Amino acid sequence: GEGPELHLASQFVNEACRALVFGGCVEKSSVSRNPEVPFESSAYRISASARGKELRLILSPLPGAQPQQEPLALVFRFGMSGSFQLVPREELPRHAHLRFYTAPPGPRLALCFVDIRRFGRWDLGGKWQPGRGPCVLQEYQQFRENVLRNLADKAFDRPICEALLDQRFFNGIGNYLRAEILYRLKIPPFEKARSVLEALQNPDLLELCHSVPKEVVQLGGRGYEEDFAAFRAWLRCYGMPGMSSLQDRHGRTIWFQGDPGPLAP
DNA sequence: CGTCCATGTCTACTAGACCTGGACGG
Numbered sequence: 078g079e080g081p082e083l084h085l086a087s088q089f090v091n092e093a094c095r096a097l098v099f100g101g102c103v104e105k106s107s108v109s110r111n112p113e114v115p116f117e118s119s120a121y122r123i124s125a126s127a128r129g130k131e132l133r134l135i136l137s138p139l140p141g142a143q144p145q146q147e148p149l150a151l152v153f154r155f156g157m158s159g160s161f162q163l164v165p166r167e168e169l170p171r172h173a174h175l176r177f178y179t180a181p182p183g184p185r186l187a188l189c190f191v192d193i194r195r196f197g198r199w200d201l202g203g204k205w206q207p208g209r210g211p212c213v214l215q216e217y218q219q220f221r222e223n224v225l226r227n228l229a230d231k232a233f234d235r236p237i238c239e240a241l242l243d244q245r246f247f248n249g250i251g252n253y254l255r256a257e258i259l260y261r262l263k264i265p266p267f268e269k270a271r272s273v274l275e276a277l278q279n280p281d282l283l284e285l286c287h288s289v290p291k292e293v294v295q296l297g298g299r300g301y302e303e304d305f306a307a308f309r310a311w312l313r314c315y316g317m318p319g320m321s322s323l324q325d326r327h328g329r330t331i332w333f334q335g336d337p338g339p340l341a342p
Numbered sequence: 343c344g345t346c347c348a349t350g351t352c353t354a355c356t357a358g359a360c361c362t363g364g365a366c367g368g
Binding site: 078079081082110130154155156157158172192193194195196197198242244251252253254299315326327328329330 | 347348349350351352356357360361362363
């Protein structure tokens with residue numbers, strides 16, 4: 078679900094589809110309320126890139142494919158349970174909501190956006206969501222600037238643990254990353270955001286917003302039962318024995334150690 | 343059987359709503 082997983086999903090799409098050629102239409106499950114993808118091509122390649130908590134697929138017709146198609150872009154958010162899988166055409170997982178079909182010569186495969194709870198969404202248009210800040214993984218300096226330029230924003234009145242989830246400034250950070258980040262600096266989660274970002278204008282909190290998710294990207298994995306164990310072995314705080322936890326203002330669990338901090342409930 | 347919990351938004355009147363499924367309680 079978080080920035081590293083989106084990033085790994087987009088590497089997965091790029092690598093797994095490196096030698097695939099897709100054809101035909103793009104199929105959506107009936108249950109899915111996201112929009113139909115009007116795209117048909119006899120021969121196209123798929124590629125991807127990630128930005129924070131979004132992923133962009135590009136569908137690219139080979140030369141001379143028919144019908145006529147200019148490339149198409151789609152932007153995915155995963156919600157709580159999204160992923161991409163490459164599977165045998167007739168062995169679709171349950172909840173594969175959007176499906177791209179390889180073309181012949183070779184084994185009939187399907188690239189699927191798989192999403193159990195259907196919190197994920199896509200849009201037509203390759204446009205990043207307006208409002209999202211820069212990617213903490215891939216656009217670090219922009220990300221860092223955008224936070225420091227904007228400390229007056231009322232978002233920074235909130236505890237630091239809540240501010241870290243705001244995708245306008247922390248695009249890519251989610252519930253496990255906020256615990257892991259805060260925990261490396263032993264910053265109380267209910268310290269006030271502005272105070273912690275008002276005295277830093279030895280990695281600092283904004284640097285870890287980049288390097289911590291980068292560590293995850295570097296474990297590789299997220300199924301892209303063995304890889305989940307490397308991840309579990311990497312977590313130091315989120316869900317771990319001996320840690321405290323509390324409910325933030327929006328009912329989400331913050332894991333931490335020690336001082337809850339002045340704005341605690 | 344039931345309750346609770348989960349890597350996020352999204353929406354409409356901060357408190358649900360939107361979903362499925364696994365762990366675990368009786």
